[PDB]
Amino acid sequence: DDPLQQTGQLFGGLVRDIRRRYPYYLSDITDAFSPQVLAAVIFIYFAALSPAITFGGLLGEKTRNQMGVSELLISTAVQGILFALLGAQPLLVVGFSGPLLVFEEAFFSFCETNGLEYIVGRVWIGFWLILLVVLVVAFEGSFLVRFISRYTQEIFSFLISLIFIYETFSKLIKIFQDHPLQKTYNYNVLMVPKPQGPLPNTALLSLVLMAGTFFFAMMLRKFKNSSYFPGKLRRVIGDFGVPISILIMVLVDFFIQDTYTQKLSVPDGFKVSNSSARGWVIHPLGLRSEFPIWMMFASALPALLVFILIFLESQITTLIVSKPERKMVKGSGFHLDLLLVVGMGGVAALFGMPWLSATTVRSVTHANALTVMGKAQIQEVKEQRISGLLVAVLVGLSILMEPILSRIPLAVLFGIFLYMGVTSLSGIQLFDRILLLFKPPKYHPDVPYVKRVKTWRMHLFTGIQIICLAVLWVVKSTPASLALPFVLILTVPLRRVLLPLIFRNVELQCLDADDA
Amino acid sequence: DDPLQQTGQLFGGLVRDIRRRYPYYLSDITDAFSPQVLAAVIFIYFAALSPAITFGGLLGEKTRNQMGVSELLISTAVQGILFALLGAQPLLVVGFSGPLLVFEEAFFSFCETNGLEYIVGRVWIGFWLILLVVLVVAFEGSFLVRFISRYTQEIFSFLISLIFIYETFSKLIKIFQDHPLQKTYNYNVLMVPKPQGPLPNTALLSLVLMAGTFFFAMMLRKFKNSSYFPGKLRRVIGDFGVPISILIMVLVDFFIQDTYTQKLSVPDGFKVSNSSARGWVIHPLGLRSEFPIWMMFASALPALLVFILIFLESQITTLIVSKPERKMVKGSGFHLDLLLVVGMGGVAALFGMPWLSATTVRSVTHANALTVMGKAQIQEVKEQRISGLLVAVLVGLSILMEPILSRIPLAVLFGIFLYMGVTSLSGIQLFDRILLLFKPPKYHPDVPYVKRVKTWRMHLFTGIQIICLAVLWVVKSTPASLALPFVLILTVPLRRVLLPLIFRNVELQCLDADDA
């Protein structure tokens, strides 16, 4: 009944993952029949689409359109469908992540200097990824995930929420920089790719649209837990809170005629970003020049970095989502999900498309959206495969449905990202204890780590975790940002060898507890 | 011990008002020693100044500067000081009101058509006002205030809060109309009296400044009642919540350089608005032409309307403020306050300055600001004469302190007015029952009118009051807006003769109760 356990047989953990979950397959279809599930699809679609559009454009720039938006929309769609149908935890949301973009910029630059075909180079990384994951899953290497405690989990989940919130505000500020509040503006600026010079009212409306969307989202959640209107109506308006918030502020922008705001932009059709550079299928041996044999072997080194990047964020995401506290009964599979994510990623390379990963903020948003609230306590979660399938299909079709998307401002979606980031800081005990730094000890809750631990020692423990977050944020800022996963790893030694010198066993049990 | 009681002796009620309150005079000075009282001064100053600036300008326009801002600042100041020192209820805030402006426009128009000296005409209204109030106070006519029940009080207090909120939003919308969000503007526009044409970023920044100020104000009140920080620090930051909210958003505007926003504007010095038309002292018999004898007698008719206008709003304001629910022990005086307000107003006329009135939203704001919260229940009120004195003095000096005021945006103060309007809808039982229309009857409070009255009959009673508010709002909208006081009066018949046909005695006791 314990997922993270070494059996002895090859592919032991994987067979136990399939046998565990696939019996519930029909339930994974019939549980989706609920308007809450539909409200979840609409929400998580916009969560899933905007990153693909944003990161896809950054790949286009950094890579000379050898990979761009089209490639990432297709990858996100196809890998999204396959994972929704075959995966052990369907509530995970596979997609491109900041760390993966950083690597792609890094590997491109290497190939420019050394005179390699970048897109052909990725194919060999992809072959090594397939070889690595089939070895790991064979010898049941996912069992090591059991040594990642709450301590490391909450440092990770908290950092990822802060970064998410930080980047959203960075995007708002960019608008102000591009379109500053001036006395006079040139009034013949071209709009062909984008506004050439600054224009009036764009930055302040963007702020209003953002602040508007966030407010309605937060208010309709407050309303959901209120005692106004009949419960059946109040629950439904609460479920569709985010889609209502979006629809309101999208109509606000629609009626405001003469003021410019940035809209979502998908590619024209389904075709590679640079048609001259590459086709659909990338040749291993080379496109123009012969691919060198040393790099076919040397690609093993980048493959290990990409593996670790995908593994850590994906397996920790799974831990966070599949916690006992959140009422998920169907069962998670670490062995099966690893194989699909990394396996599909290795194959994607061969069609010049990005390998993806189970991303934390989106996956957690998706899981929270399907959670029903009793009395406030968690009653159950709507664990099904339809939400994840429909979002993957919609992201794929997004190119066809440009007429709808071309009327949605980004500023509106920034409000929904602010909502997602804030809402994600919920069951994290780190955040709870950080708040108790500011409350006096009289008005502290009756949770075990308050009663059984002295207030200053509890605070010392919180402070040490805050110092970890600081060190992680500094490494983030420096050029060596691909090290972040390997610095998270060091949080496991800290907890296991260092902290027991300072804190006694009884304190470390209550503070860093498995089930709470 | 009952204020509203007929003794038999001439000036009986007045002597009992003075004997009651003036024993507490030293306490009315030493109770002001508290930072809460200082935070109240700063708040109520801006509440008191902006109306005087706004209404003063409208008088300037409507009256050809025979009365303007200077006259109303001086009147508000002098009458404010005298009332703070001599009055029976010092928490009342005397000033100009919308109804009074309407009358002044009306009386001016009459004098233009009939060929009378408007400013000389007011002097005779003022003489009649002095004669009326000395008769009323002699024969103890303020005793009739006891027949104004909760029913009429809450219809009045609710209407006045709605109008207040409506007018604030009307001012924001005017900014958008003056400075619309267009694609191209003209930049050679002049700013000598005010912006001639529309300007970019002005309307959306005004909205942000307003929405900003309101948010901080509401959040710092939430914080006051929270369990964060040490209580002594949390209480102080809660007390100075509004002055902090103002200071924040005033600094936001300060650093934003090139964008235009409207600022507070006081007159240059202490001098009459139109020096040619009038001097400081107005001659009864006439300035240029001889004032006619028929109008010296006919002025009795306008005097009755002005009396009723001032009496009703001032005496109902006193009822609302001096309720048992609000812990005010010092004691209110209806006979003394009436004499001062209307007496001072009659004399003001002789110096060509406006008669004023105890205004509801400001007085209620002032009283709430001085209320301390135990545990949430009302512990006590800081009843003193210093708050009201300092605000009256500051309004007088406002002309001298133009350098400070010229950096305060109005948009910021609109946020504080929104806060005042919302906060004023608090202890009104009408508002409470209007909210229960939307709650299901399971989640209704254990107040007597819920237990002892059937839910639909309670709702029928609420609905009849909503129909009164509607009828009052329609009369407001029509040209005959000076009738509003006389339509409020009819709410007393409704309660006393009509409602007891529909509702039984037991229901009317619980619904419309004196102490609750």
Ligand SMILES: CCCCCCCCCCCCCCCCCC(=O)OC[C@H](COP(=O)([O-])OCC[N+](C)(C)C)OC(=O)CCCCCCCCCCCCCCCCC
């Ligand atoms: C805790 C609460 C504090 C935060 C408040 C909520 C978040 C902050 C953002 C406010 C939401 C605003 C969204 C709409 C803004 C529209 C702006 C614009 O383009 O103007 C349109 C229009 C201009 O476009 P137009 O359509 O009139 O132009 C006419 C041209 N034709 C005819 C061709 C179409 O502006 C106006 O005319 C005025 C409209 C009102 C605008 C502002 C209303 C905002 C109300 C909210 C007040 C906030 C304070 C707090 C309220 C708390 C409630 C309890």
Ligand SMILES: CCCCCCCCCCCCCCCCCC(=O)OC[C@H](COP(=O)([O-])OCC[N+](C)(C)C)OC(=O)CCCCCCCCCCCCCCCCC
């Ligand atoms: C339950 C919660 C309800 C929350 C409701 C929503 C918030 C209500 C407040 C309304 C918006 C007020 C914005 C702040 C005021 C300053 C804005 C301004 O004009 O500055 C522009 C400033 C100044 O513009 P500038 O033209 O002077 O340029 C600045 C650069 N220099 C100095 C070199 C010239 O520009 C900025 O750079 C951007 C700052 C943007 C404002 C900060 C982000 C806020 C976004 C909304 C957040 C939503 C609520 C979050 C709540 C968290 C709690 C859960």
Ligand SMILES: CC(C)CCC[C@@H](C)[C@H]1CC[C@H]2[C@@H]3CC=C4C[C@@H](OC(=O)CCC(=O)O)CC[C@]4(C)[C@H]3CC[C@]12C
């Ligand atoms: C932002 C980055 C740079 C980290 C800083 C985080 C702080 C919130 C942390 C770090 C260390 C913590 C402190 C570690 C040690 C102490 C001493 C402790 O007092 C005693 O030793 C108690 C007396 C006793 O020994 O019985 C009181 C809490 C305090 C100040 C802690 C409060 C919270 C602190 C300041």
Ligand SMILES: CC(C)CCC[C@@H](C)[C@H]1CC[C@H]2[C@@H]3CC=C4C[C@@H](OC(=O)CCC(=O)O)CC[C@]4(C)[C@H]3CC[C@]12C
């Ligand atoms: C004046 C304009 C702006 C409309 C706003 C007024 C409404 C909010 C009020 C007016 C009369 C009220 C109604 C008066 C009578 C009834 C019937 C009552 O049901 C019964 O009496 C049915 C028989 C029974 O249950 O005994 C339910 C409440 C209701 C709809 C009241 C609800 C609130 C109403 C519609």
Ligand SMILES: */C(=S)=N/C1=[C]C(S([O])(=O)=O)=C(/[C]=[C]/C2=C(S([O])(=O)=O)[C]=C(N=C=S)[C]=[C]2)[C]=[C]1
């Ligand atoms: C756009 S959208 N801006 C944006 C958004 C994000 S995200 O994915 O958080 O919405 C990012 C991602 C940043 C990120 C990093 S990075 O790139 O700053 O090193 C690292 C990690 N992982 C760890 S530990 C997570 C997210 C960038 C830009």
Ligand SMILES: */C(=S)=N/C1=[C]C(S([O])(=O)=O)=C(/[C]=[C]/C2=C(S([O])(=O)=O)[C]=C(N=C=S)[C]=[C]2)[C]=[C]1
């Ligand atoms: C400016 S400030 N605008 C503004 C503000 C107010 S305020 O603050 O005094 O509410 C008013 C006043 C309106 C008002 C009326 S009126 O003028 O609309 O007839 C009547 C009553 N009384 C009754 S019953 C109270 C207030 C106008 C403009």
Ligand SMILES: *[C@@H]1O[C@H](CO)[C@@H](O[C@@H]2O[C@H](CO)[C@@H](O)[C@H](O)[C@H]2NC(C)=O)[C@H](O)[C@H]1NC(C)=O
């Ligand atoms: C599309 O692909 C062509 C072919 O690679 C790119 O051409 C490159 O141009 C950059 C400068 O922008 C040079 O550094 C390379 O040497 C060029 N490559 C070759 C072999 O021609 C072009 O940049 C790409 N355009 C897009 C869409 O980004």
Ligand SMILES: *[C@@H]1O[C@H](CO)[C@@H](O[C@@H]2O[C@H](CO)[C@@H](O)[C@H](O)[C@H]2NC(C)=O)[C@H](O)[C@H]1NC(C)=O
């Ligand atoms: C200042 O006072 C003079 C004197 O009353 C005002 O002159 C009036 O002008 C209006 C037209 O605006 C005429 O209808 C009146 O007949 C004039 N009155 C007289 C007797 O001359 C002038 O309007 C006032 N100016 C200000 C500051 O409003």
Ligand SMILES: CC(C)CCC[C@@H](C)[C@H]1CC[C@H]2[C@@H]3CC=C4C[C@@H](O)CC[C@]4(C)[C@H]3CC[C@]12C
């Ligand atoms: C193209 C290839 C290399 C990539 C895909 C990975 C392949 C090799 C993986 C995916 C699923 C795996 C199988 C899943 C389950 C079982 C049943 C077990 O009793 C024996 C091993 C066996 C039969 C596995 C062998 C290896 C396997 C077929």
Ligand SMILES: CC(C)CCC[C@@H](C)[C@H]1CC[C@H]2[C@@H]3CC=C4C[C@@H](O)CC[C@]4(C)[C@H]3CC[C@]12C
């Ligand atoms: C396209 C962007 C701009 C906005 C998307 C919002 C749309 C899809 C949302 C907003 C509110 C939603 C509705 C809200 C409530 C219900 C009741 C439920 O029992 C059936 C679905 C239904 C009828 C929803 C349908 C979808 C809906 C119309």
Ligand SMILES: CC(C)CCC[C@@H](C)[C@H]1CC[C@H]2[C@@H]3CC=C4C[C@@H](O)CC[C@]4(C)[C@H]3CC[C@]12C
């Ligand atoms: C309905 C569900 C299952 C599918 C959703 C995704 C669909 C619409 C997407 C995903 C990948 C896409 C394909 C990717 C590549 C090609 C090759 C090109 O030469 C023709 C278009 C074509 C064939 C695309 C058409 C649309 C496509 C099939």
Ligand SMILES: CC(C)CCC[C@@H](C)[C@H]1CC[C@H]2[C@@H]3CC=C4C[C@@H](O)CC[C@]4(C)[C@H]3CC[C@]12C
């Ligand atoms: C002039 C306009 C723009 C803003 C006015 C705000 C000023 C007067 C307010 C803002 C915050 C206030 C301070 C907040 C808290 C305290 C602590 C108290 O124990 C003494 C007064 C003192 C020190 C206040 C002094 C006045 C103050 C500085």
Ligand SMILES: CC(C)CCC[C@@H](C)[C@H]1CC[C@H]2[C@@H]3CC=C4C[C@@H](O)CC[C@]4(C)[C@H]3CC[C@]12C
């Ligand atoms: C215009 C207003 C402000 C002033 C004019 C009102 C005058 C006439 C009022 C104000 C105070 C009044 C006095 C208050 C107290 C007393 C004591 C009593 O035993 C006999 C009446 C007597 C002596 C009153 C007579 C009238 C009085 C003097």
Ligand SMILES: CC(C)CCC[C@@H](C)[C@H]1CC[C@H]2[C@@H]3CC=C4C[C@@H](O)CC[C@]4(C)[C@H]3CC[C@]12C
């Ligand atoms: C500080 C407290 C006690 C008083 C507050 C209000 C003060 C500043 C106001 C109220 C009445 C005002 C006066 C009204 C009339 C005149 C006559 C004029 O020819 C010169 C200015 C002068 C003399 C004003 C100066 C300022 C003044 C005294």
